[PDB]
Structure formats: C-alpha cells, structure tokens
C-alpha cells in the first residue's frame, strides 16, 4: 500500500519565471503512518505585505497553521523561509499558494522540496512522558518496547510486568519483599509468594523496614492489594504508609499475593518471616 | 521486494539465563539499498579475556571488523558496548557469538536490538566531496539532486549544466562573458553566443578584464574550449591565463562557442564587442 518512498518538488505557477495574479493553488502531501513530512525551499521570492495578506505560501498541518510565508527576508510581522526546515504534524502537510491582483516587481515565486522521514517515538523529550516503560525501540514507520530482566511486556505492549510470582520458601526464616524494594515497585504486576513448612510449625510474619503501598482516603485499597492467605483465615488487604502489626498465624502454609495497578511510585513493603513449634 | 520495515532482536543462547560453552552462532542482518543498520545492546555480560579471545561478540560489516566485544566494562585492550550505538557499513551487518570451553562465573550473555535506518547521502562531511553539484535532496532509500536557476541537471544526474546558450546580440556594442564571471564557470556546459548585425558593419572583439580558461601544458585546450566562428574564418580554441589579442573580424555575424568539462575552478573570460563600418 506504501511500497514507494514519498518525496517530491513544489513550484509556484510559472517557475522559474514570474508568477501570475489571482492565482490559487494547493498541494496535499501525505506520508504513511509513522512518518512525517520535511519541507524546505530552494527558492523563495514573493511580494511583501502586512501579515502576507496579498501573496503568500501557507503551510498547514491539520488545524495548525505551521507557516505563512511572504517576501524575501523576514520581518516582525512577516516570515520568509530562508534555509529553514518545516516538519508536518502527523503524516500529512498542506501547502497553499495565493496571489492577489497585482505585482509591482516581477517576483519569481518559489521552489520547495519535500520528503517523508521516520518519526522517532523513542525521542528524549527532556520533560515529557515516554511511550514504553523500560526500553524503547524505534523503527521505520513505528516503534515497540521491551523490558529489563525479570519482566515481561504487559498486554498493553508498553508496561513491564514483573516476574514476581514463582517464589517458594521452605526455610525456617527469611525475607520477602515487593519487587525492586526499597525502590518503587513496578506496575500491573501480580506477585504470588508461597511459604510452605512441615506440619509441626507455625509461621510468624513481620512487616519490618518500611511500608508504603498506594492507598485511597475513602475506599481503602483499590489500587494495589497486599493480601495474606493462610490455612485458618485471610488477612488484608493492606495499604498505607505505616508498618502493619505482627501476624501470628497458626498454620504452616501461607500465600502472600500482591497486585499493582498502572501508576504510582510507592516504595513497597518488606516482610521477615519466622516460625516456631 | 522490501515492503516491510527491517528490525529485530538478538540474544545469546539461553538468554536471559547463563550461556553455554563451545557455542558458535551468527546473524546476518540485511537492509534494502539506501539503508544501513543500527544496533545497540540492552544487555551485555560476558567473560573478560585478552583481546576477547575466549568469549566474544563480533560486529563485522563487509571486510571491516566494526567491533569485538567482551566482558562487562571496557579496558585498554577489550571493549564492552555499554550504551554505544553501532552502524553498519552498507546495507548489511554480521554479528558473531563465540564462547570457549569454560566460564568461571555464570555470565548471562547479551541482548541486542537492531533496526534499518535511512542513509543521508546529502550529509555535510565538513571536508569531503558532496554527491550533487548544487542542491542535494535526501529521501528514504536514496537521494537525488537539483540545480540553481539558470541550470539544468546533466545526464549524469549530478552535474549542473548552465543554460548558457540562447543569447543573441543585435546591438552595436556590448559585453558577453562565461557563466557566473568573474566567479568560476560551471561544468559540462555548452554555451553558444550569437552576434548578428546589419550587412554594413564589421564586429571587433576585445578580451577585456581577465582570461583564465583551463589549459594543458602539452595538448593545448582539450578541457575547456573557447572558439570564435565568423563568416570569413574561425578563431581558437583559446586557453590560458592571459588576455588574447584583439580580433578584428571583417564580418557582421559571429558565433562564440564555449564548452567545459567536468572539473576545474577557473574564473573564465569576458569579451567586449564593438563594431564599425
Ligand atoms: C543555505 O543552504 C545552502 C546550501 O543548500 C548554503 O549554500 C547557504 O549558505 C545556506 N544559508 C545559510 C544562511 O546557512
Ligand atoms: C543507557 O541507556 C539507559 C536507557 O535505555 C539509561 O537508563 C542509562 O542511563 C544509559 N547510560 C548512560 C551511561 O547514559
Ligand atoms: Ca501580488
Ligand atoms: Ca518510528
Ligand atoms: Ca500502583
Ligand atoms: Ca567462556
Ligand atoms: Ca537516503
Ligand atoms: Ca573545466
């Protein structure tokens, strides 16, 4: 559908000769998705007038008026292109030439050259939001993203969900924490921790260093959910910014599930588990 | 033939797990003509050894060995990629992974991402030669060139030949010169000047300000030829760096042809023609 590259040349009527009066002309340049248009002038010589009302070349991209060019050299109220480069917003750019009823001097019009180039969606905005969560990979006509080690790309193909499940503890004591603790825990992750001991023991849980899981002031914990499910009962969900109290379970088996939503920079939780008999 | 964009992912055997011993592997990435390949690593952790003889990832583009990467962080004799970006020479790039018989530590190998990007043939080399004579226009997978006003693109589609022919002088006196005089005259141009007066007059030719047409020390004027053809005889070809003597023709018609080759920065000639009866 777009097998050939997009480029070309635009000229005022009669170029390189003098352009006429009462002329109205336009070119609509379109590129494939993922591309934008780059336009520049090899030649520009038009009638100068206030706000370029008489003769002009107008570059519009969508509803935006990218440029209104007149004259030979720019003023405080008029712009001439010179060696400037004009980039379309999106894969289309419209160029309109208009001339009024008269020319005092024999103005020779314009010559411009355009070409489609790739958009780099992985650009470093130095202040704005970036497409993908971890690694951004740009290619001609598109982009895609990937994640660091320990993650898999979410269904939305941008978020990096943590490989947080899979941990099984058979030891008498130990530590388990939210992913990347004490650094902010990842987004859209479903982490399941298992603790399985022999039939004689009971497991004790201690929230130890810092607790900070996203919380709403009215609804309690609709964003990120830390639940503790044993054999006797279940505990939670836990949310907030202070250490939850000690949990003396009467069981030898306990599963801790921790789910996260798509936003937040909360630093998470850490649990030291012990056991007695 | 190349309807889809070129991009992809490369990993060491077993990534993200430990890579094995006695492994030999390679990927040959190819882009369409006009494109080159851009490769970078999201992950790199290999065995360090002198000149990366034991384990390595080698980037070769043609006969050139672009890189030989080992270890975690670079040394005086070994290189590790880090965040560096590697560009192929031409539309192909080969990547070779090799591992020897043993690994002391559990090295986790590499992850790399590549994509085809356009070559900008119109680049500003800041010292080298530029593709086209006047204006260079880059597009995806290629380039083309154009000329200033007064020129047409030569058959070779790079050189700008001057629209130098077409001038006819009916006046009693006047000036004709090589194109762009006193600036160096263009290349591969065939310029014909005509001087046509009434039957009663004879035309006088004066080489006036400066003469500088390309000349060979043995063969006289095989590069650029300035010939003067009247009704009685012909004069020339003229070449060299000094003003030719006055030419009193006995005719009312004279054609001056001036042809140029594909190189040279010689400033040209200027002729003031007069006439009497
Ligand atoms: C504009 O570009 C041309 C080359 O295409 C160059 O000769 C000229 O110097 C440039 N003008 C400026 C102000 O850089
Ligand atoms: C390498 O790139 C990553 C982003 O992909 C960035 O986090 C890291 O700081 C970069 N390293 C350096 C030394 O710039
Ligand atoms: Ca006008
Ligand atoms: Ca892109
Ligand atoms: Ca959250
Ligand atoms: Ca090894
Ligand atoms: Ca190109
Ligand atoms: Ca020459």
XYZ file of C-alpha atoms and ligand atoms in Angstrom:
588
model
C 0.000 0.000 0.000
C 3.003 2.270 0.617
C 5.675 0.403 -1.396
C 7.418 3.501 -2.765
C 9.182 6.291 -0.830
C 7.454 9.658 -0.533
C 9.261 12.720 -1.884
C 8.809 15.460 -4.465
C 9.083 19.013 -5.755
C 6.701 22.006 -5.489
C 6.808 25.186 -7.567
C 4.879 28.430 -7.899
C 2.961 28.748 -11.175
C 5.376 29.608 -13.963
C 8.560 28.877 -12.011
C 11.274 29.912 -12.565
C 9.500 32.731 -14.413
C 7.323 35.408 -12.838
C 4.155 34.071 -11.215
C 0.783 35.477 -12.185
C -2.008 37.355 -10.468
C -5.216 35.978 -8.934
C -3.612 32.561 -8.554
C -4.888 29.987 -6.063
C -3.164 26.633 -5.752
C -2.578 23.815 -3.247
C -0.707 20.557 -2.687
C -1.623 17.953 -0.091
C 1.355 15.780 0.798
C 0.664 12.529 2.643
C 3.052 10.010 4.184
C 2.398 6.515 5.566
C 1.626 6.159 9.293
C 4.712 6.551 11.477
C 6.133 9.129 9.112
C 6.117 12.892 8.919
C 6.956 15.334 6.155
C 10.032 17.514 5.857
C 9.868 20.533 3.545
C 12.378 23.230 2.607
C 12.736 25.905 -0.057
C 15.464 26.092 -2.674
C 13.939 29.348 -3.852
C 11.681 31.984 -2.330
C 10.831 35.438 -3.676
C 7.323 36.819 -3.163
C 5.547 40.136 -2.663
C 5.940 41.541 0.834
C 2.768 42.771 2.547
C 1.389 43.099 6.082
C 0.822 39.626 7.551
C 1.412 38.383 3.999
C -2.188 39.186 3.075
C -1.539 39.868 -0.616
C 0.640 36.962 -1.753
C 1.544 34.009 0.452
C 2.595 30.393 0.820
C 0.857 28.782 3.798
C 1.961 25.539 5.444
C -0.852 23.939 7.424
C -0.736 20.605 9.207
C -4.202 19.664 10.379
C -5.896 22.568 12.140
C -2.492 24.072 12.887
C -1.086 26.868 10.739
C 2.590 25.935 10.659
C 3.683 28.864 8.497
C 2.545 31.854 6.447
C 5.421 32.877 4.195
C 5.839 36.053 2.127
C 8.521 38.403 0.846
C 12.254 37.774 0.597
C 13.514 38.346 4.140
C 11.515 38.063 7.358
C 10.115 40.956 9.441
C 8.430 41.430 12.833
C 5.084 40.513 11.259
C 6.080 38.513 8.183
C 8.139 35.369 7.750
C 10.363 34.264 4.886
C 11.619 30.635 4.932
C 15.284 31.068 4.108
C 17.075 27.819 4.881
C 14.587 26.753 7.491
C 13.123 23.280 7.599
C 9.428 22.641 8.160
C 8.093 19.458 9.747
C 4.478 18.325 9.450
C 2.390 17.337 12.448
C 1.366 13.809 11.563
C 1.647 12.091 8.180
C 0.133 14.978 6.177
C 1.032 18.544 5.231
C -0.898 21.018 3.093
C 0.760 23.816 1.137
C -1.304 26.685 -0.244
C -0.168 29.319 -2.726
C -2.188 32.508 -3.169
C -1.547 35.696 -5.136
C -3.707 38.814 -5.297
C -4.420 41.162 -8.196
C -1.041 42.815 -8.817
C 2.742 42.717 -8.510
C 4.813 45.911 -8.569
C 8.050 43.980 -9.100
C 8.498 40.777 -11.151
C 8.552 38.327 -8.205
C 9.723 34.865 -9.254
C 7.810 32.730 -6.750
C 9.125 29.634 -5.005
C 10.704 26.224 -5.361
C 10.402 23.735 -2.492
C 11.391 20.104 -1.955
C 9.691 17.651 0.401
C 10.347 14.101 1.629
C 8.857 11.649 4.121
C 11.018 10.775 7.111
C 10.505 8.413 10.058
C 9.158 9.575 13.388
C 11.283 8.625 16.385
C 8.683 7.871 19.043
C 11.503 6.932 21.435
C 12.705 10.550 21.489
C 14.118 12.046 24.694
C 11.611 14.812 25.466
C 13.661 16.013 28.464
C 10.474 16.581 30.474
C 7.527 14.719 28.938
C 6.239 11.145 29.030
C 7.943 8.291 27.189
C 5.930 5.647 25.218
C 7.171 2.431 26.839
C 8.006 1.595 30.467
C 11.609 0.375 30.108
C 13.324 0.093 26.713
C 12.114 1.957 23.632
C 12.911 0.608 20.155
C 12.288 2.817 17.126
C 11.902 1.569 13.553
C 10.781 2.994 10.205
C 7.059 3.684 10.454
C 6.697 2.547 14.039
C 8.068 1.650 17.436
C 7.845 -1.079 20.031
C 9.083 -1.593 23.545
C 10.729 -4.174 25.782
C 11.512 -4.722 29.451
C 14.510 -5.395 31.683
C 15.498 -8.797 33.049
C 12.862 -10.132 35.423
C 9.975 -8.624 33.493
C 7.563 -9.380 30.657
C 5.806 -6.857 28.433
C 2.204 -6.295 29.521
C -0.805 -6.939 27.277
C -0.926 -3.200 26.530
C 2.510 -3.687 24.956
C 4.049 -0.783 26.884
C 4.031 -1.655 30.587
C 6.614 -4.025 32.051
C 5.022 -6.504 34.466
C 7.356 -8.138 36.992
C 8.018 -11.865 37.047
C 7.165 -11.622 40.731
C 5.341 -14.923 41.179
C 7.133 -18.264 41.483
C 8.929 -17.848 44.808
C 8.569 -20.714 47.286
C 10.097 -20.649 50.777
C 10.831 -23.913 52.603
C 13.264 -22.411 55.110
C 12.607 -21.736 58.788
C 13.066 -17.987 58.390
C 13.713 -15.453 55.654
C 12.861 -12.238 53.848
C 10.409 -11.489 51.062
C 9.669 -8.061 49.615
C 7.842 -6.228 46.852
C 9.785 -6.168 43.569
C 12.787 -3.805 43.494
C 12.335 -2.867 47.183
C 13.181 -0.334 48.546
C 12.868 1.234 45.073
C 9.285 1.812 43.807
C 7.512 -1.427 42.868
C 6.557 -1.980 39.192
C 3.130 -1.602 37.617
C 0.401 -4.066 36.598
C 2.197 -6.962 38.302
C 0.604 -9.943 40.055
C 3.112 -11.372 42.523
C 2.462 -14.565 44.492
C 4.788 -15.639 47.304
C 4.491 -19.064 48.944
C 5.735 -20.219 52.347
C 5.490 -23.963 52.984
C 6.873 -25.634 56.107
C 6.462 -29.014 57.798
C 3.245 -29.893 59.622
C 4.636 -29.095 63.063
C 5.443 -25.419 62.605
C 3.557 -22.119 62.729
C 4.698 -19.102 60.725
C 5.112 -15.570 62.070
C 5.070 -12.542 59.756
C 6.799 -9.230 60.461
C 6.482 -6.071 58.381
C 9.971 -4.856 59.107
C 11.633 -1.852 57.469
C 9.196 0.352 55.606
C 5.600 0.142 54.446
C 4.291 2.263 51.582
C 1.560 0.837 49.368
C -0.787 3.111 47.387
C -3.931 3.969 49.327
C -7.146 5.910 48.749
C -8.550 8.089 51.569
C -12.131 6.785 51.206
C -12.069 3.385 49.540
C -9.212 1.627 51.298
C -7.011 -0.278 48.866
C -8.478 -0.283 45.325
C -5.147 0.432 43.613
C -2.547 -2.008 44.934
C -3.527 -5.009 47.043
C -1.357 -6.873 49.555
C -3.274 -9.904 50.858
C -2.110 -12.686 53.181
C -3.925 -16.022 52.921
C -3.075 -18.854 55.346
C -4.946 -22.025 56.290
C -7.129 -20.660 59.096
C -8.159 -17.299 57.659
C -7.077 -14.479 55.377
C -5.547 -11.108 56.227
C -5.773 -7.792 54.402
C -5.789 -6.091 52.044
C -3.037 -3.875 53.460
C -2.432 -0.319 52.235
C -0.922 2.818 53.723
C 2.311 4.309 54.962
C 2.978 2.669 58.323
C 4.154 -0.790 59.422
C 1.265 -3.248 59.840
C 1.301 -5.171 63.153
C 2.830 -8.625 63.662
C 0.804 -11.551 62.346
C 0.967 -14.795 64.286
C -0.567 -17.394 62.003
C -1.360 -20.820 63.393
C -0.510 -22.548 60.127
C 2.494 -23.951 58.270
C 1.320 -22.748 54.863
C 0.837 -19.138 53.797
C 0.422 -17.472 50.402
C 1.009 -13.738 50.016
C -0.464 -12.089 46.922
C 0.464 -8.574 45.821
C -1.180 -6.903 42.829
C -0.412 -3.460 41.407
C -2.153 -1.030 39.042
C -0.741 1.036 36.180
C 0.636 4.034 38.098
C 2.379 5.182 41.274
C 5.894 5.458 42.684
C 5.286 3.903 46.100
C 8.308 2.157 47.618
C 6.530 -1.014 48.748
C 6.879 -3.444 51.641
C 9.248 -5.906 53.300
C 8.384 -8.981 55.366
C 10.620 -11.073 57.597
C 9.014 -14.433 58.273
C 9.963 -16.613 61.236
C 8.487 -19.837 62.647
C 8.104 -21.887 65.848
C 6.509 -25.080 67.184
C 10.617 -6.755 -2.600
C 11.253 -4.774 0.597
C 7.646 -3.999 1.630
C 8.171 -4.448 5.376
C 10.479 -2.480 7.710
C 13.661 -4.149 8.936
C 14.145 -4.534 12.688
C 14.623 -7.244 15.296
C 16.124 -8.724 18.446
C 19.310 -10.777 19.023
C 20.153 -12.848 22.097
C 22.955 -15.071 23.345
C 21.998 -18.749 23.606
C 19.870 -19.273 26.695
C 19.212 -15.590 27.392
C 18.429 -14.369 29.969
C 19.961 -17.470 31.564
C 23.641 -18.392 31.564
C 25.060 -19.099 28.107
C 26.846 -22.358 27.415
C 30.331 -23.424 26.426
C 31.687 -24.212 22.950
C 28.933 -22.138 21.365
C 29.244 -20.692 17.862
C 26.441 -18.599 16.421
C 25.808 -15.835 13.867
C 23.158 -13.487 12.491
C 23.360 -11.717 9.145
C 21.174 -8.620 9.087
C 20.389 -7.092 5.695
C 18.613 -3.858 4.795
C 17.368 -2.582 1.423
C 19.710 -0.392 -0.659
C 19.992 3.151 0.687
C 19.699 1.891 4.236
C 22.128 0.947 6.957
C 21.748 -0.959 10.202
C 21.739 0.445 13.714
C 22.446 -1.941 16.595
C 22.637 -1.481 20.365
C 22.678 -3.690 23.447
C 20.068 -3.740 26.186
C 22.196 -6.292 27.997
C 25.849 -7.297 27.938
C 27.724 -9.554 30.358
C 30.449 -11.850 29.024
C 33.740 -13.398 30.111
C 36.638 -10.957 30.064
C 39.845 -12.147 28.387
C 42.788 -10.647 26.492
C 41.574 -9.255 23.155
C 38.336 -11.105 23.933
C 39.840 -14.358 22.660
C 37.792 -16.674 24.884
C 34.222 -15.392 24.564
C 33.183 -12.598 22.217
C 30.522 -10.863 20.162
C 31.972 -9.588 16.881
C 30.313 -6.992 14.655
C 31.621 -7.152 11.097
C 30.401 -5.106 8.157
C 31.940 -6.416 4.966
C 35.681 -6.929 5.350
C 35.710 -4.423 8.200
C 35.702 -5.586 11.814
C 33.471 -2.964 13.409
C 33.677 -4.376 16.931
C 34.934 -7.227 19.107
C 33.046 -7.096 22.394
C 33.761 -8.948 25.649
C 33.438 -8.543 29.402
C 31.285 -6.067 31.308
C 33.283 -2.833 31.179
C 35.884 -1.846 28.593
C 39.689 -1.931 29.029
C 42.773 -0.770 27.104
C 42.616 -3.946 25.006
C 38.984 -5.025 25.320
C 35.731 -3.276 24.502
C 32.312 -3.566 26.113
C 29.361 -1.918 24.291
C 27.606 -0.120 27.117
C 25.125 2.323 25.620
C 27.037 2.716 22.407
C 25.378 2.540 19.025
C 26.847 0.579 16.132
C 26.224 1.475 12.493
C 26.808 -0.934 9.613
C 28.837 -0.014 6.554
C 26.355 -0.583 3.763
C 23.029 -2.422 3.956
C 24.404 -5.470 5.813
C 25.858 -6.288 9.225
C 27.049 -9.626 10.587
C 27.052 -10.483 14.285
C 29.024 -13.460 15.569
C 28.819 -15.007 19.026
C 31.555 -17.358 20.221
C 32.245 -18.991 23.582
C 35.164 -21.224 24.539
C 35.294 -24.251 26.828
C 34.605 -22.761 30.269
C 33.127 -19.971 32.376
C 34.371 -19.292 35.910
C 31.380 -17.075 36.698
C 27.787 -17.544 35.454
C 27.895 -14.906 32.677
C 24.430 -14.124 31.321
C 25.313 -13.192 27.738
C 23.725 -10.415 25.707
C 20.542 -8.879 24.381
C 20.726 -6.527 21.390
C 18.184 -4.711 19.225
C 18.673 -3.672 15.600
C 16.744 -1.610 13.038
C 17.228 -0.334 9.491
C 17.535 3.424 9.087
C 17.942 5.662 6.029
C 21.310 6.862 4.818
C 21.585 10.615 4.336
C 23.784 10.901 1.258
C 23.407 14.693 1.425
C 25.372 14.776 4.692
C 27.724 17.678 5.433
C 31.116 15.947 5.589
C 32.875 19.196 6.583
C 35.822 18.346 4.320
C 34.881 15.667 1.782
C 33.070 15.620 -1.558
C 29.310 16.072 -1.872
C 27.184 13.881 -4.239
C 25.471 16.545 -6.355
C 26.750 19.850 -7.767
C 24.188 22.286 -6.318
C 21.218 21.102 -4.237
C 21.121 17.713 -2.525
C 17.770 16.078 -1.725
C 17.691 13.047 0.567
C 14.849 10.525 0.757
C 14.259 7.100 2.310
C 16.446 4.619 0.455
C 18.002 7.150 -1.879
C 18.874 10.667 -2.926
C 18.697 12.930 -5.939
C 19.955 16.359 -6.838
C 18.872 19.597 -8.485
C 20.392 22.836 -9.740
C 20.022 26.579 -9.218
C 18.137 28.932 -11.525
C 19.786 29.115 -14.933
C 20.855 25.484 -14.908
C 19.648 22.011 -15.865
C 20.746 18.719 -14.331
C 23.306 16.939 -16.512
C 22.784 13.458 -17.968
C 24.906 12.057 -15.124
C 22.173 13.365 -12.812
C 24.649 15.151 -10.534
C 26.310 17.942 -12.515
C 24.506 21.222 -13.163
C 24.967 22.381 -16.762
C 24.407 26.088 -17.428
C 21.646 27.363 -19.683
C 24.400 29.340 -21.374
C 23.215 29.126 -24.977
C 20.388 31.257 -26.366
C 21.922 34.732 -26.200
C 21.641 36.848 -29.352
C 23.152 40.334 -29.657
C 21.745 42.812 -32.188
C 23.248 45.907 -30.570
C 26.207 47.922 -31.835
C 28.301 47.156 -28.761
C 28.082 45.122 -25.578
C 29.517 42.589 -23.160
C 29.373 38.806 -23.095
C 31.122 36.557 -20.590
C 31.458 32.983 -19.389
C 28.691 31.959 -16.970
C 28.971 33.431 -13.455
C 32.028 35.536 -14.414
C 34.204 36.534 -12.610
C 33.292 33.535 -10.421
C 34.430 30.100 -11.717
C 32.426 28.926 -14.737
C 30.231 25.800 -14.363
C 30.981 22.294 -15.593
C 29.855 20.254 -18.615
C 28.174 23.284 -20.199
C 27.897 24.080 -23.911
C 27.367 27.820 -24.306
C 26.678 29.450 -27.678
C 26.673 33.235 -28.058
C 25.480 34.920 -31.259
C 26.235 38.410 -32.567
C 24.198 39.488 -35.595
C 24.377 42.984 -37.082
C 23.293 44.618 -40.339
C 25.163 43.923 -43.575
C 27.197 47.126 -43.427
C 29.059 46.568 -40.172
C 32.157 44.684 -39.025
C 32.497 43.397 -35.468
C 35.520 43.880 -33.212
C 36.180 41.574 -30.250
C 38.111 42.537 -27.120
C 39.116 40.184 -24.318
C 38.902 42.793 -21.612
C 39.234 42.121 -17.883
C 40.624 38.692 -17.119
C 41.299 35.491 -19.019
C 41.550 32.133 -17.265
C 40.401 29.027 -19.116
C 41.729 25.561 -18.204
C 44.810 24.631 -20.210
C 47.128 21.641 -20.572
C 50.898 22.226 -20.912
C 51.312 19.830 -23.869
C 47.984 19.414 -25.626
C 46.655 22.956 -25.783
C 42.967 23.126 -24.909
C 41.441 19.634 -24.505
C 39.479 20.519 -21.357
C 37.534 23.723 -21.993
C 37.200 25.190 -25.478
C 36.545 28.824 -26.401
C 36.100 29.094 -30.182
C 35.136 32.111 -32.294
C 33.496 31.410 -35.656
C 32.694 34.298 -38.031
C 31.916 34.375 -41.750
C 35.458 34.597 -43.132
C 37.291 32.174 -40.854
C 37.355 30.693 -37.370
C 39.497 31.612 -34.372
C 40.725 29.467 -31.496
C 40.453 27.428 -29.442
C 41.642 29.817 -26.726
C 43.043 28.606 -23.398
C 45.423 30.013 -20.810
C 45.813 32.754 -18.253
C 46.458 35.927 -20.237
C 44.293 38.231 -22.373
C 44.108 37.098 -26.013
C 44.801 39.872 -28.561
C 42.133 41.995 -30.265
C 40.218 40.317 -33.079
C 39.135 42.487 -35.984
C 36.648 40.388 -37.914
C 35.512 41.561 -41.325
C 32.011 40.191 -40.838
C 28.672 41.203 -39.333
C 27.917 37.746 -37.947
C 29.911 35.902 -35.297
C 29.156 32.869 -33.128
C 31.194 32.201 -29.992
C 31.056 28.670 -28.587
C 32.369 27.773 -25.137
C 32.380 24.195 -23.856
C 33.518 22.978 -20.437
C 34.462 19.616 -18.908
C 33.527 18.107 -15.545
C 36.128 19.758 -13.293
C 38.088 22.936 -12.589
C 37.643 26.246 -10.781
C 38.918 28.581 -13.498
C 37.382 32.062 -13.459
C 36.678 32.334 -17.190
C 36.642 35.130 -19.755
C 34.984 38.423 -20.669
C 34.525 39.952 -24.121
C 33.519 43.481 -25.064
C 32.340 43.587 -28.658
C 32.262 46.784 -30.709
C 31.564 47.469 -34.397
C 32.280 49.908 -37.250
C 31.609 50.453 -40.961
C 21.503 27.646 2.836
O 21.859 26.370 2.227
C 22.775 26.498 1.125
C 23.085 25.106 0.642
O 21.940 24.461 0.106
C 24.038 27.239 1.543
O 24.791 27.499 0.363
C 23.696 28.547 2.238
O 24.872 29.086 2.814
C 22.729 28.292 3.370
N 22.428 29.529 4.071
C 22.779 29.727 5.340
C 22.422 31.082 5.915
O 23.314 28.838 6.015
C 21.900 3.901 28.925
O 20.520 3.981 28.462
C 19.552 3.792 29.510
C 18.189 3.955 28.890
O 17.914 2.941 27.937
C 19.771 4.784 30.646
O 18.915 4.402 31.717
C 21.219 4.767 31.109
O 21.434 5.853 31.992
C 22.141 4.969 29.929
N 23.527 5.000 30.365
C 24.280 6.092 30.254
C 25.693 5.970 30.786
O 23.863 7.118 29.703
Ca 0.770 40.120 -5.688
Ca 9.468 5.146 14.052
Ca 0.270 1.481 41.941
Ca 33.916 -18.756 28.315
Ca 18.593 8.479 1.631
Ca 36.886 22.769 -16.725
